[PDB]
Assembly symmetry: C2
Homo-oligomer: 435 residues x 2
């Protein structure tokens, strides 16, 4: 609450085709890599979201170059003329991805200020000889006269070392790689994050001119030659958004009458990365046809099967489980969902409960008592986050009646225009105001 409102009239069956945009998180890592380099980086299949717009403005405010071609979905950036030690606070604080610009700011200027969770990020850069200086305001100053190589076991940034999972795991790996690339010497990273988040950043860094060796399955060696080695021009096509694919599969299975075709350049590679999710889909009884540039989600033909899983760093995405919870409402029996990344991330549960979905929450565990599909109309829902807004919207579309959803502004940070895309499929969603 939450002034603008989404007026949802569910009960309508969706039909047609959807095209996906690039992975938001790999967009962040690619741009962060480009900020350290002096060469232009052309990013194809770039999503038209908030993250792209802000990063572009940050680059231009830094004296660098950034341009997004909407008709081409191409984002070209160049930090060769980068010339700022401090970026506008309001701009930086608008997105989360600005945090990975710190290795660029530190290596280029020697001094950087972190405008007011990032202890792990500061701890990682601290391994490379970066001094942490806190002068109130909740803001931190980064200082480094010179960068030194190091050997880091990335399990130091996990909550559970056996499970190899944690909220600080992913960010620490991304930062360490960036630091190692702008550092002279051999940096060794052990037990690194494995999703395309980090994988695609490695490819970009290699193309820039960095020497990154996969010495072992759990050992990455960075033969760093400083920022001056990153001078080679790069052309990269982003992997389709992993969570957006999950979102559309959930939409097709529950809201469509005919098989929903979901397209994207090299989406088969996105599916392979979603192997934990797809294992669950197969275990639940969800049918998805997989092609090279398209996947096809089939509507329900019978009750799904309940599953038990844990959302973890080297497994099912934390952003994936809310959609799997909604699918659990159509399964016959209890679906157990444990969160091993962002402990308290079941804020969508009380809102799904208003729609008729029965859930139980104890600490890190969510249980869905299927079957309990959403059916209650005339409710007023409040989104708590990005994926919450998405899953609530899909659930509301299944309810033959009127549902109001607020705080849907979160959607812009994960999707281009999820409302508009659903409307194209036949969804009846209207933009209104509270009074």
């Amino acid at each position: 609450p939450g002034e603008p409102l989404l007026e949802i009239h569910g009960g309508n069956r969706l039909s047609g085709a959807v095209r996906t945009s690039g992975f938001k998180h790999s967009l962040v890592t690619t741009v962060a890599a480009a900020a350290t380099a002096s060469a232009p980086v052309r990013i194809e299949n770039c999503p038209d979201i908030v993250e792209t717009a802000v990063l572009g403005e940050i680059f231009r405010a830094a004296g660098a170059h950034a341009h997004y071609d909407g008709a081409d979905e191409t984002f070209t950036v160049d930090a060769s003329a980068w010339d700022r030690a401090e970026l506008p606070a309001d701009l930086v604080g608008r997105i989360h991805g600005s945090l990975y610009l710190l290795p660029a700011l530190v290596s280029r200027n020697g001094v950087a200020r972190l405008s007011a969770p990032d202890e792990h990020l500061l701890d990682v850069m601290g391994r490379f000889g970066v001094t942490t200086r806190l002068t109130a305001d909740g803001s931190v100053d980064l200082t480094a006269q010179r960068l030194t190589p190091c050997t880091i076991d990335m399990l130091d940034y996990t909550r559970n070392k056996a499970l190899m999972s944690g909220p600080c795991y992913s960010g620490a790996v991304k930062t360490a790689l960036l630091m190692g690339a702008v550092t002279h010497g051999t940096t060794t990273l052990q037990h690194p994050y494995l999703k395309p988040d980090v994988t695609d950043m490695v490819t970009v860094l290699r193309d820039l001119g960095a020497d990154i060796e996969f010495a072992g399955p759990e050992t990455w060696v960075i033969h760093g030659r400083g920022p001056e080695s990153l001078h080679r021009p790069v052309d990269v096509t982003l992997i389709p958004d992993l969570i957006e694919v999950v979102t559309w599969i959930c939409a097709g299975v529950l809201l469509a009458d005919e098989p929903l075709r979901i397209t994207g350049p090299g989406i088969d590679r996105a599916v392979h990365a979603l192997a934990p999710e797809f294992d669950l889909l197969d275990r639940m009884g969800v049918r998805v046809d997989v092609g090279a540039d398209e996947v096809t989600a089939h509507p329900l033909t019978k009750p799904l099967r309940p599953v038990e899983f844990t959302a973890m760093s080297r497994g099912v995405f934390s952003d994936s489980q809310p959609f799997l919870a909604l699918l659990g409402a159509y399964a016959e029996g209890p679906t157990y969902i444990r969160e091993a990344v962002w402990e308290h991330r079941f804020g969508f549960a009380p809102e799904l409960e208003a729609l008729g979905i029965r859930t139980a929450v104890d600490d890190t565990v969510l249980r869905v008592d299927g079957p309990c599909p959403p059916h209650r109309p005339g409710t007023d829902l409040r989104a708590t986050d990005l994926r919450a807004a998405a899953v609530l919207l899909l659930a509301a579309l299944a309810v033959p009646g009127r549902t109001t959803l607020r705080n849907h502004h979160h959607l812009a940070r994960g999707y281009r225009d999820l409302v508009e895309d659903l409307v194209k499929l036949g969804a009846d969603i209207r933009h209104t105001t509270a009074p």
Copy 2:
């Protein structure tokens, strides 16, 4: 140190047929229900283990009747002439199953002494029925109850995680509450009960004794208790095959046999259905098991297995099944993630599997196996920490083409009739030696 060892020479392929024994835990609950009654209870397919012997001795020591016929594996008990006196402490403390005799004792004599796994949750359950407790210096507890009163209990009160419905006090609290409900005058209503045959079979026994237990809802059990005087009907019951023994043999057949290992047991299909969470994992790993009525057939490896992540929980995979699934994970291509949500700190088998060559990692409630990493290192000295640890180490040792020693294998007698003898019968080279 002059202490008995197992001398294992692995590398040999096992073959033949194995017959399972009755469920150890169902035996306890059936006997516990019998202790409250005034009628003879004939228990067929009764396992010849430590529990059977001690429970039999406890009955006779209290003036009651108990006779085990090892020929046809039949345990016949009768608590009709059960009198009131001191129960031999050392005798009672020999087994864990004696804890569930408390409802019978407190209801028959009004008093019961709990001589010194936790039992504090047991006392809380009985406390709701009006049982009073007081402490003895050595940690012993004296139970008193002039009159028992019915109660309405949500069993989630005895779980660590309410949403997951899992905890170390869950199953025991349900067993106690059910027993207390039957020996109490009045209507007792239990909510969200434990669902394994462990409890399920005791319900059937109590019903056959004369109790009126009703499944009002999916999560609602109602016991119209009419006291111990209502439990006077003779009962014939054939135990469900031991659930963990089935798991143990399936694990053995897949990894150690060269031909499909036939595993028999009366009504083993019920055991399989109860092991549905375990079998869902087996199917996901690529393990083939042919399921029949009185037999199951476990097939040896034809190709590497697939890794799985799961959580051992009360309404899911057994905690005792996890060590054998960990060993299977060593033959899978990828990381197997195992989370314990019942009995904290029981990955004591992991450092011993490490010595054989198996790659493991342990952090609190989580165990990870980095497959492929099959056991191969010979010439080690393995120490068992518990029952299932001794079994899984013995199976892993039989895979190693060399000599391996295993001690503290005395734990096996509390879970298996004679696991060593049964394995040797299949072609295993296991010898009984001594430490020096």
